[PDB]
Design a protein around this ligand. Structure first.
Ligand code: CU
Ligand code: CU
Ligand code: CU
Ligand code: CU
Ligand code: CU
Ligand code: CU
Lengths: 333, 333, 333
């Protein structure tokens, strides 16, 4: 059966960008092959130069977004180079059985494996490392991502009508728990393991030191701000593998939102803010109507502006005065 | 076009009360004019006399609830008297563009401005101050409120049938982060700015010192308890601009609930408790069936009874023994 | 009227098990009688032998799950033996009036009472102790449970079709706040009251020391793991009376989920993870398709694997290679 199915290999791209794909499937079910390389590396996450030892899928935090269609077969080749120091594996929330594949993908440095699973349920799902005994440590070190399983006939609105996006971005939100000394300064380590004992103590406080989008404070700002134009329909996929988040587009809305990310359910309309539970991926669809800068944030504003969970959207186009206008510019009474 | 539209001016009232309005619009679209004055003032929030320097819209925490209809134009005159010390602005989650209006409403003390925006989406929304660089500080100082955009034909249930309320109350929940000394006592300041550095440090703990309804512990109790009668249909609007909350009416339910507050979506039925994400406004509809005192609380009972997120509902009428009855009063075995 | 109704007495069983009942009612409305005895007792909650003074309904944490049908009358005899030291009562989120019955069920040690209420709304609800002045203390000491009010014609899917479960389990999640000394060690007490002052201080931190399923770390693991077989339809009822939780079945899904637990609403489909707000009970329906061990967890993995919110499901049957297969077992590159 499967031997008879067509196979296509796809090359992943770095978040927030997404690899090429078709919204409406043009072919029948296929075996979609992906390759990911685990990479333990140092990452500086803030403007003060705070450095951590991140555990990543393909060298990025979050790991890349995989896109397939309902009933396609996902075949992943997972490689753990001998330059790494820890055992890793992968748990797909999209898969059925063996801890999402975690029990079948345990690879020590210098090992590799290939897992295949049927994408039976449509929606956006979280995937993350989950080694027995140190699950939270690997997950909060940046080892998680997301996979999107699109219905074979694309997305639809609450009334069964087609929803087509012009652009898609993947925002991975990550909570970090950096160990601190007596005065409150962050500690630095030489190797991932040298941080273990301290890492566990920091996690137990349940209080993150940093909460970031795309691996670092201000990563989606400045020259890296997300872009769009008035009239463009954008789909924003957002994931949080360990903690709740409440995305909000300052100046806009979520026209159609799947907060818990499962497409067989009708979307919620006109959302101002939505709750994505820790360990879930959600998606929001919006058509830009005004140009300018938009602040895409986790709406616990302390987490957004003090901890790092904030990004920018830069939109081009003509301003619509009917929707909004300054009748009297700020002036002296 | 707009010059041709009828205009009506409305005077806001102090929460939990709401200004006069029509549920079902009796006129076509209009320009609804509101005026709000920013007020930085000292507020004591608990029984021990803990005092803070609140930043308010119209002198209250929360700011007043504005009510308009879908497709009406909201025109707000925002005044920042020269008696204030900080720059302020306003971000309407209900508006489209320029950070909800935040980028067009920056007023220094002694300045005023007038913004107009089209209320294109129905539902209850949060509005809050958002000055670049000190957003969380202003928001957690009490500078937020809510606006309700009613469908032109009023509220409807899950089956498209009309829902009419007899009473409406606005409960604004506020998380405060009061700086403390070594022993755990709250610090007092002379001016808002003298608290800034300390305020930022307290917020980063992500742990509120107080979580209150209507600006203070016990503000909606005693002589200020919310009132209703058996048979009355009540709509309770609840907002939290920065933190998640889980409202619950002890002794009752949310017959029809819009947890994320957007009316184009069908309400959730028979809710015991619902989650309102930080940065969102929700609404719950309930018909009282029993007289007595009801405890309206944030159902994280520590936040409710230890931190202050609890209010009272006092309902008059006849007790229904079919619904509930004490068969054997507490007595010695 | 009620005098004329048939009456049946039911004997409760210890969680995670549930007492015998019919999904589809075979009789008309009845008076369902239950008896519960309050029990203050010492409980060790972790592997290090940490001991607490729990306040329980029927000697367990959580209290037992009660099952009745819509419009049945629940009659509870609540006994507080003279061996107990505190006053207790019961608040049913399923009931209407008098604080869910809390105002009518205040019993001092050596007292008992009998309350009756009409189960007018279908769904799973939380019930908990709520004595004026020490509500959070009693609730976070383990004094809460849940009651399920099934529609008279059983559960149905999003399309009105019948949903029948073969097995049902009740998972009660409990957040504990154990007082600690200067070094971080847990304090031990002789009597419940001797812990009061310290208990209040620990709760105010809003940071649990333990978050467990069925009263203890690892309570639903090993020989006590939940069991099922491939092909079996299982309903998992989950409750949290004070704090939000985000259940997730590692290796599976929630085919049909009522996150806020009210059956008059259509279920959410194909959920990977769902949010149950503090003070709520939810239910998830799943048909096992693969054998093996599944990790049922609160998906804030720190709370799950460091604090104790994790259990096991052990499923028997034949492995399905179409759904998942290891193409290349972990091997040296
Ligand atoms: Cu790993
Ligand atoms: Cu906002
Ligand atoms: Cu301000
Ligand atoms: Cu309650
Ligand atoms: Cu009690
Ligand atoms: Cu997981």
């Amino acid at each position: 059966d499967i031997s008879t199915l067509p196979r296509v290999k796809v090359d992943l791209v770095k978040p927030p960008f997404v690899h090429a794909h078709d919204q409406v499937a043009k072919t029948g079910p296929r075996v979609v092959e992906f390759t990911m390389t685990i990479e333990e590396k140092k990452l500086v996450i803030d403007r003060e130069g705070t450095e951590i030892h991140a555990m990543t899928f393909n060298g990025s935090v979050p790991g890349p977004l995989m896109v397939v269609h309902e009933n396609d077969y996902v075949e992943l080749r997972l490689i753990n180079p001998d330059t790494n120091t820890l055992l890793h594996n992968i748990d797909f929330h999209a898969a059925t059985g063996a801890l999402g594949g975690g029990a079948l993908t345990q690879v020590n440095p210098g090992e590799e494996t290939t897992l295949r699973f049927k994408a039976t349920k449509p929606g956006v799902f979280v995937y993350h490392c989950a080694p027995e005994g140190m699950v939270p440590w690997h997950v909060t070190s940046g080892m998680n991502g997301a996979i999107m399983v699109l219905p074979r006939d694309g997305l639809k609105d609450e009334k069964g009508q087609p929803l087509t996006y012009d652009k898609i971005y993947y925002v991975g939100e990550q909570d970090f728990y950096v160990p601190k000394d007596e005065a409150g300064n962050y500690k630095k380590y030489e190797t991932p393991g040298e941080a273990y004992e301290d890492a566990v103590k920091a996690m137990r406080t349940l209080t993150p030191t940093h909460i970031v989008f795309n691996g670092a404070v201000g990563a989606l700002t400045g020259d890296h701000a997300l872009t769009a134009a008035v009239g463009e329909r954008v789909l924003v996929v957002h994931s949080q593998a360990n903690r709740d988040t409440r995305p909000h587009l300052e100046g806009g809305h979520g026209d159609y939102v799947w907060a818990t990310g499962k497409f067989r359910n009708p979307p919620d309309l006109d959302q101002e803010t939505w709750l994505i539970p820790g360990g879930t991926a959600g998606a929001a669809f919006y058509t830009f109507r005004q140009p300018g800068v938009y602040a895409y944030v986790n709406h616990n504003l302390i987490e957004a502006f003090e901890l790092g969970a904030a990004g920018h959207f830069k939109v081009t186009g003509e301003w619509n005065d009917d929707l909004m206008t300054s009748v009297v510019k700020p002036a002296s009474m």
